[PDB]
Amino acid sequence: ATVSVSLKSSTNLAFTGKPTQVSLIVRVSPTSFASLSGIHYVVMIDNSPSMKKENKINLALSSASRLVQDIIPGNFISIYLFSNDIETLYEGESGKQIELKSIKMGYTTNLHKAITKVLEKFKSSEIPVKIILLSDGKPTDKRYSRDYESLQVPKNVQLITIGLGEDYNEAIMKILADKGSGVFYHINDPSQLPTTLVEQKSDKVAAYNLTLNFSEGLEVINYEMPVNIPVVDKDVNVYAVGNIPPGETDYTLKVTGNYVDSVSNKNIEIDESLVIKRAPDDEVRSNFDRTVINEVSYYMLLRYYGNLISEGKSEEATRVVQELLTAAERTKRVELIERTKKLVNDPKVDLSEVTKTMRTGSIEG
Amino acid sequence: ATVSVSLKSSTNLAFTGKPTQVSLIVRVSPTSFASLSGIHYVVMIDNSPSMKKENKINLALSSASRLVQDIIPGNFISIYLFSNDIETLYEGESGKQIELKSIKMGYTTNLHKAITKVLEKFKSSEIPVKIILLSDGKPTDKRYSRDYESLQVPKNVQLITIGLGEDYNEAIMKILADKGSGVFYHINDPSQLPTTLVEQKSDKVAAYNLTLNFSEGLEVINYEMPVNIPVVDKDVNVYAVGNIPPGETDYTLKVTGNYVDSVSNKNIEIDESLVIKRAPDDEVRSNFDRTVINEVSYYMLLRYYGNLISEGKSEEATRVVQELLTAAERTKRVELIERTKKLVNDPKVDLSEVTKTMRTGSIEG
Ligand SMILES: [Cl-]
Ligand SMILES: [Cl-]
Ligand SMILES: [Cl-]
Ligand SMILES: [Cl-]
Ligand code: NA
Ligand code: NA
Numbered sequence: 001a002t003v004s005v006s007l008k009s010s011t012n013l014a015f016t017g018k019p020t021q022v023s024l025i026v027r028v029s030p031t032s033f034a035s036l037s038g039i040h041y042v043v044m045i046d047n048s049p050s051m052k053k054e055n056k057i058n059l060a061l062s063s064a065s066r067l068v069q070d071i072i073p074g075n076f077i078s079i080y081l082f083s084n085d086i087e088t089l090y091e092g093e094s095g096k097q098i099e100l101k102s103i104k105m106g107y108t109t110n111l112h113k114a115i116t117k118v119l120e121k122f123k124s125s126e127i128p129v130k131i132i133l134l135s136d137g138k139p140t141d142k143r144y145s146r147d148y149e150s151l152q153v154p155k156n157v158q159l160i161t162i163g164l165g166e167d168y169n170e171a172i173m174k175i176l177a178d179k180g181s182g183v184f185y186h187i188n189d190p191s192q193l194p195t196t197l198v199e200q201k202s203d204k205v206a207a208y209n210l211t212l213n214f215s216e217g218l219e220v221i222n223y224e225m226p227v228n229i230p231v232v233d234k235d236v237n238v239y240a241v242g243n244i245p246p247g248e249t250d251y252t253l254k255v256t257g258n259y260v261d262s263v264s265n266k267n268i269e270i271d272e273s274l275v276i277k278r279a280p281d282d283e284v285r286s287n288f289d290r291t292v293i294n295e296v297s298y299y300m301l302l303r304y305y306g307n308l309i310s311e312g313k314s315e316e317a318t319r320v321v322q323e324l325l326t327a328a329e330r331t332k333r334v335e336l337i338e339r340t341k342k343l344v345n346d347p348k349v350d351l352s353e354v355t356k357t358m359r360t361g362s363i364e365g
Numbered sequence: 366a367t368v369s370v371s372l373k374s375s376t377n378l379a380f381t382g383k384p385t386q387v388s389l390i391v392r393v394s395p396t397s398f399a400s401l402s403g404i405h406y407v408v409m410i411d412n413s414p415s416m417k418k419e420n421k422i423n424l425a426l427s428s429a430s431r432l433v434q435d436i437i438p439g440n441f442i443s444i445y446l447f448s449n450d451i452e453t454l455y456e457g458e459s460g461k462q463i464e465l466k467s468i469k470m471g472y473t474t475n476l477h478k479a480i481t482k483v484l485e486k487f488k489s490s491e492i493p494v495k496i497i498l499l500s501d502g503k504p505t506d507k508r509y510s511r512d513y514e515s516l517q518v519p520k521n522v523q524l525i526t527i528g529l530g531e532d533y534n535e536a537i538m539k540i541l542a543d544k545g546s547g548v549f550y551h552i553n554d555p556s557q558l559p560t561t562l563v564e565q566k567s568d569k570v571a572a573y574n575l576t577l578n579f580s581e582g583l584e585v586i587n588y589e590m591p592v593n594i595p596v597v598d599k600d601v602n603v604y605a606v607g608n609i610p611p612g613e614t615d616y617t618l619k620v621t622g623n624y625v626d627s628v629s630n631k632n633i634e635i636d637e638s639l640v641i642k643r644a645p646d647d648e649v650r651s652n653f654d655r656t657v658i659n660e661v662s663y664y665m666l667l668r669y670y671g672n673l674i675s676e677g678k679s680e681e682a683t684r685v686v687q688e689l690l691t692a693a694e695r696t697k698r699v700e701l702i703e704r705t706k707k708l709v710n711d712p713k714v715d716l717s718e719v720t721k722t723m724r725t726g727s728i729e730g
Contacts, residue, residue: 019658217665241582300608316614
C-alpha cells in the first residue's frame with residue numbers, strides 16, 4: 001500500500017432519544033512514492049486583449065513551455081489558449097522542448113464555455129487530469145460565481161485556478177477551484193506567475209484517482225463530495241460534520257473508496273469504518289472529544305468566512321476573522337494559526353487563502 | 366403568488382462554544398391553481414422479451430395511449446420503447462387519440478443507456494419534464510444500483526419509476542426515483558399497471574420549475590439537493606438537518622430559489638430566512654423544539670432504513686422498522702403511522718413505500 005487512510009471521530013457513542021452530532025477528520029497519508037506516470041496536465045491560458053498587455057501572455061507561455069519540459073517523461077500535456085473560444089497550442093508528451101507562441105484569436109473571455117468544453121473532453125475518463133486555468137480578467141459569458149455552481153467536474157479531474165492582478169473575478173476563480181478540488185492562487189504581480197505555474201508539476205506521487213465516499217448523513221466541509229483527487233503527493237486532510245439518527249441500533253460510519261497504488265499500479269480498496277454504539281445521555285455527553293470538535297469547527301467557520309467574503313459582507317467577515325483566530329488558537333495548531341493571520345480582508349488574497357487552508361493536499365510548491 | 370413557502374426550525378438560538386444541530390421543515394403549499402400547460406411527459410417502456418409475456422407490453426402501450434389522450438391539450442408527450450436501444454413511438458401534442466403498437470427491437474435491457482440518452486435530451490432545458498420509466502426486469506448494461514449514483518438529472522426533470530412483478534431490481538428503481546425526485550411504484554400485478562400509469566397526469570398545477578437552495582451546512586434528507594421539482598400540484602414537504610458553527614455572530618439560515626407561477630406565467634423569487642442568534646448554553650438547551658426534531662428524526666431513520674433494505678440487511682432493517690413505528694408514534698402524525706405500517710420487509714414493497722413517504726408531493730393518484 002502506498003497510502004494509509006485514518007479516521008478520527010469526536011464520538012464513539014450516540015444518544016438514544018435524539019440525533020447526535022459527529023465531527024470526523026479523515027486523513028490520507030502517503031507512505032511510499034513512485035515517479036509520476038500516465039497523467040494528463042492541461043494548462044488553459046486567457047488570450048484576451050488584456051493579457052497582451054505588459055508581456056503577460058509571454059510570461060504565461062514561456063512558463064507553460066517550461067512546465068512541458070519539466071514534467072517528467074511518461075505523462076501528457078495539453079496547452080490551450082482561450083478567449084472567444086479555445087485553441088490548442090500543444091498536445092503531446094511531457095519532457096519535451098517546445099516553443100509556445102501566441103496566436104491571434106477573437107475578443108471576449110468566454111471562460112464558462114472554455115472550461116465546459118475542456119471538462120467534457122474527460123467525461124467518463126479513467127486518466128488522472130490536472131487542469132490549471134490562468135486569467136487576468138472577468139469572464140464575459142457567465143459573469144457571476146453563481147453561474148458556475150452547476151459545473152460538473154468529472155471524476156479524476158482536478159481544477160486549479162490562477163488569478164493574475166486586480167481585475168479578475170475572485171469569486172469565480174474560487175468556486176472553480178472548489179468544484180475541482182484544487183487551489184485558487186491569487187498573484188498580484190506577473191513576476192510571481194512563472195513560479196506559481198512551474199511549481200504545479202509533481203515528480204513523485206503515492207496514489208492516483210483517489211475516491212472517498214462517506215456514509216449517509218456525513219457532510220464534508222473542505223472538499224466537494226464524493227471526495228475525488230486524481231493525484232495524491234502529500235497528505236490529504238478531510239473534515240466532516242454529520243448527524244446520527246436516534247434509536248438503539250448500532251450505527252456504522254463508513255469511508256469507502258479506492259485508489260491506484262503508484263508503485264504497483266494496482267487498484268486498491270479503501271474501507272474504514274467506526275461503529276457508533278448507544279449509551280445513556282450523561283455517558284454520551286462525557287465521551288465527546290472536544291479537540292476533534294474544535295478542529296472541525298475551525299473549518300466550518302472558514303467555509304462561512306469564505307462565503308461572507310465572496311458575498312462582500314465585509315464587516316461581518318472581519319468579525320468572523322477574529323473568531324477564526326480564536327478558533328485556531330483553541331486548536332493550538334501552528335500551521336493553522338499562521339494561515340489564519342494571512343486573512344487580510346483583501347478579498348482576492350482571502351479567497352485564495354481559504355482554498356489553500358481548506359485543501360493543503362492540493363497545494364503545490 | 367400560487368405557492369407559499371414556509372420554514373419551521375427546531376431552534377432560534379445557537380451555542381457559542383460548539384456547533385449547534387438544527388432540524389428544519391420547509392413546506393411548499395399550493396395556494397391557487399391553473400390548467401397544466403407547456404410541459405413534456407416522457408414514458409419509457411421496457412421492450413425486452415419478458416415484457417412480451419402475458420400481454421404486458423400491450424397493457425403498457427394501451428395505457429400509454431390513454432395517458433396521451435387524457436393529458437390536457439397544450440402539453441407535449443414522447444413515448445419510447447427501450448431494450449438494446451431506445452426507439453420513438455410518438456412525439457407530439459397531448460390530448461390526441463393515437464394507437465401505440467409494439468415494434469420488434471433488439472434483445473437486452475440497456476436501462477442505463479436508455480435513461481442517459483433521454484436525460485441528455487433535456488440538458489440545459491427550461492421545459493418542465495416528467496419521465497415515467499417502466500420495467501419488469503433487471504438491466505443488462507449496468508446491473509447494480511451503485512452504477513446509477515453518478516447519474517446527472519437535469520434541472521426541471523423529474524424521474525418516476527414503475528417496477529412490474531418480482532424480477533426487476535428494486536434498488537435501481539429506487540435510486541432512479543431518488544435521483545429524479547420522483548416516486549418508485551412497485552406493482553406486483555399487471556392489473557395495476559393501467560391505473561398507476563394513467564394517474565401520472567395532472568390537470569391542475571400551482572407552479573413549474575420550483576428550485577429550493579439551502580444555505581451552507583444544511584442537508585436535505587428526503588430530496589436530492591438542490592431541491593428541484595418541475596411540477597408542483599400538491600404540498601411539497603422538505604426535511605433537513607444541519608450544523609451551525611460556533612462563535613458570537615448571528616447566523617442566517619436561508620432557503621432561496623424561484624418558481625414559475627402557473628396562473629400568471631411569471632417567474633417569482635423565493636426568499637425565506639431565519640436568523641439564529643446566540644445565547645448562553647442553558648438558554649439554547651431550553652429553546653429547542655423537540656417536536657420539530659422528532660419529526661425530522663423520523664425521516665433520518667427512514668433514509669437509514671431504505672439503505673439497510675437496499676443492502677439486504679434484513680434483521681437490522683426489521684429492528685429499524687420497530688424504531689420507525691416508535692418514532693412515528695412519537696410524532697403523533699397519522700399519515701405517517703399508517704405509512705410506516707406498510708413496511709412489510711418485502712424489499713420491493715418497502716423501497717417503493719420509502720419513496721412515497723419521503724416525497725408525498727411527488728405521488729400522483
Ligand atoms: Cl525534445
Ligand atoms: Cl448538560
Ligand atoms: Cl385527435
Ligand atoms: Cl444537560
Ligand atoms: Na485585491
Ligand atoms: Na417482492
